[PDB]
Symmetry: D2
Subunit: 267 residues, 4 copies
């Protein structure tokens, strides 16, 4: 397996359609031993992760909670056994209050809402790296999930701003992670039909936002030289596993696009 013998922490599972669920599945298919972290609904997350190929300990982590972060490394060391360190960390965490996304006008998101979204979606990449680098092995790899924010787009609004901040944060965590012989990169994925995204396309954040996002999805597949299947997270999971492996050993502070090549084409 691509990740035989590696110990990898995977955050961000909430449903069986989470990108992180597929990352976790693929990583286990490839020989990795996982520790999972979950937010708020631990009983649900446990029930979901029971469906993974192998059992994995689940630890609670609210990235906005200082105590959770302070205790994190000790709790992971307990789960993987003293004397063992992590080889990989997956940040698959993102949130923006609905005032910051969709039909709510861009100028009407109050800063308390965007700040919460930036905390969870961007700053937390640094928080997690701070927590976990002390328990990571040389040759290790930290990976986060990105959605290409280099051009503005309808509806995504402040979440795009949050992703712009995340990409900047990633370049700084690579500097810190380098002192540990650890890489830090993001995977920029094409749009994926997670539960939240399905609800949004169905109009959860207003009809016009739903319509624009559906339009956005169609253009993506059309632009992608090898196509893009929003219903299939596995090509993105495989990409994260590539970065977790020893096979991109000279890539750090960087962004790998798992998007069908859509960002390389105009029409």
């Amino acid at each position: 397996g691509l990740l035989d013998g590696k110990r990898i922490l995977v955050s961000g599972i909430i449903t069986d359609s989470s990108i992180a669920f597929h990352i976790a599945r693929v990583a286990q298919e490839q020989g990795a031993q996982l520790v999972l972290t979950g937010f708020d609904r631990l009983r649900l997350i446990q029930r979901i992760t029971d469906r993974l190929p192998a059992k994995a300990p689940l630890l609670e982590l609210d990235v906005q909670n200082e105590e959770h972060l302070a205790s994190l490394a000790g709790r992971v060391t307990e789960a993987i056994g003293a004397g063992n360190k992590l080889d990989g960390v997956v940040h698959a965490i993102g949130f923006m209050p609905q005032t910051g996304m969709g039909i709510n006008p861009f100028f009407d998101a109050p800063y308390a809402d965007v700040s919460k979204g930036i905390h969870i979606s961007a700053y937390s990449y640094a928080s997690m790296a701070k927590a976990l680098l002390p328990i990571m092995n040389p040759g290790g790899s930290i990976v986060g999930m990105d959605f290409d924010p280099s051009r503005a787009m309808p509806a995504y609004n402040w979440m795009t701003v949050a992703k712009s901040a995340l990409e900047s944060v990633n370049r700084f965590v690579a500097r810190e992670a380098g002192k540990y012989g650890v890489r830090s990169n993001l995977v920029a994925a094409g749009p994926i039909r997670t539960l939240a995204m399905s609800a949004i396309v169905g109009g959860a954040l207003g009809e016009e936002a739903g319509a624009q996002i559906q339009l956005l999805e169609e253009g993506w597949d059309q632009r992608a030289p090898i196509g893009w299947n929003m219903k299939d997270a596995t090509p993105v999971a495989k990409t994260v596993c590539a970065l977790l492996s020893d096979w991109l050993p000279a890539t750090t502070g960087d962004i790998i696009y798992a998007d069908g090549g859509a960002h390389t084409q105009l029409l």
Copy 2:
């Protein structure tokens, strides 16, 4: 003059070495009629702006204060006279608490501090545009100040992250500003020896940060095909005035680099 008859709001003057001071001077030399906004120390700012080529009303604006923003357009309309609108807006506002810049390790900036810095340095570009677009003329121009955040750098730390967020915000304000026939752009300047920057080079945020920043400055001039003079803000002021003019009428959501060309060269 390049800006004859234009009415332009200029934020961000705090000392006679502020980039915004030079923007204001150059704009007045070019025939613009100004309204100034200042933060906190209004008596000082008045004394500084007395030195400008022409008199200009000074209005208080703390970009973190909802009431200041709510009243802003009415106060500007009063200063410029009912029935007149603004043609230009200059955002020259930036701040990051010292935990987010310098020798303080990147991972040790508490989120309350980075959030304050992002509020002032990035979100406020949207706040000001929201406040002022209702009183801007078609063909108008909003300009903000950027420091190229596309690669990480020593010391600047979370301020670089804030600038990454600002660039993303700018692309979204261009969408909103377009409905008014208004452009929105940033000028990415090379490093300038403002009071704060002089103190930082002199070690205000720790010796090693001062040393790295001085090194950064030297490399800039060395890379710039036409050189770079950190002691002279006027080429950056002139660039802002270019964007405020009618001479870049098809540029919006964009970034103009006033940096001697340094960002286009590797060594």
Copy 3:
């Protein structure tokens, strides 16, 4: 006028719909004294340029002709008078054989054809700078015309490759031009309905290429926050004049987008 007293060479006029025709017109409206260069059909070009606001000497320049280039500076000095130097140079030259554009498959352009297109469209920017820098004043400006090649697009095929080469060439000419106190930049324009482009949309290079290009044009206006009018070259002419002026004095090796902001937006 924006360019009062400046002496500026303008290449690339072939019809009254050439972008360079509008550059020349606007520059003369702004007080510039022009020298024109034309390719092959000098009698036609003279008849076209007779319609400019002021008379201007026309010099023959085939950018593929070593002798034309060797004699160029002497011929310009003769036209503007000994002891006078140029302040500005406009490169508005581009060509790709039809095997390199349109419905002809990308893989079927023979290298002799792409090499001719790269010679005329990219290398010649360096040729002209080599010829003219010896007769340019400090504070001068060289400007070339770009079409954003950062993503691939239907039909434009090898011309896009040529533009990618041009952008790289520009960064190197900025290094050389800097020794003379001269700036070098490109204006990346949105699509403009020149004669050649009209013929192409009408199917001169095959129906499907025409269709894709028309689609490309529509998306541009739709993406542009301030819109995009392919029938109007003046906003691009104005942008070139901005770079020819003293108002972007710290920008070199760079690209200014006169495209309605379309490149900053995804949808």
Copy 4:
């Protein structure tokens, strides 16, 4: 092995320090069956490749020779056996005449020399893809070698321009390769001490060019968060193998940086 059962063509071996030699070695260590192509000095190349972990047929390919290209697919099919197709193609070909690199002034490279360099270094990526896609399997991968040309640099001169053209070509070959279910990407490597590069650092193209390149190398390692070892090609070989594998299945028209992260950092 990462590439078990894959059939892969590897061009560009000339010495045992060629990047392509290490690509070939690593690919064979990972279970790939290779076909090699070599230019001009076939007897030498055979002697060098005898040192690879496994035997591999060597086919002559001068990328400037139309007949070599016309016969290429038939010769490969013969070497791998009728009914078998390629899964991978590695383009590791680059050349620029010495008038286009080093101390020879940028403006003094005659176009015949740069055209030869662009033919070999950029156009040939399209030539090879044209030749080989008809004999590639769905899920296959074409990879070329890039040196980041987004900023100008001393000495590399027209080779940087050639790399800018290559990156553009890659995005177009991805469009064509997509019709075959094939990906096309480049690996942008940090500087590597190949024979040619060692000679250049030692002054083969003039002292000042040698000095600037040595300076360039040192800055790279200094900028790279995980460091950069110019004497070790294996991290770049591993990266090429990652792209040849099934583990980046949604990446095409793209660039992966195997450069220690140096391009993500300013200082």
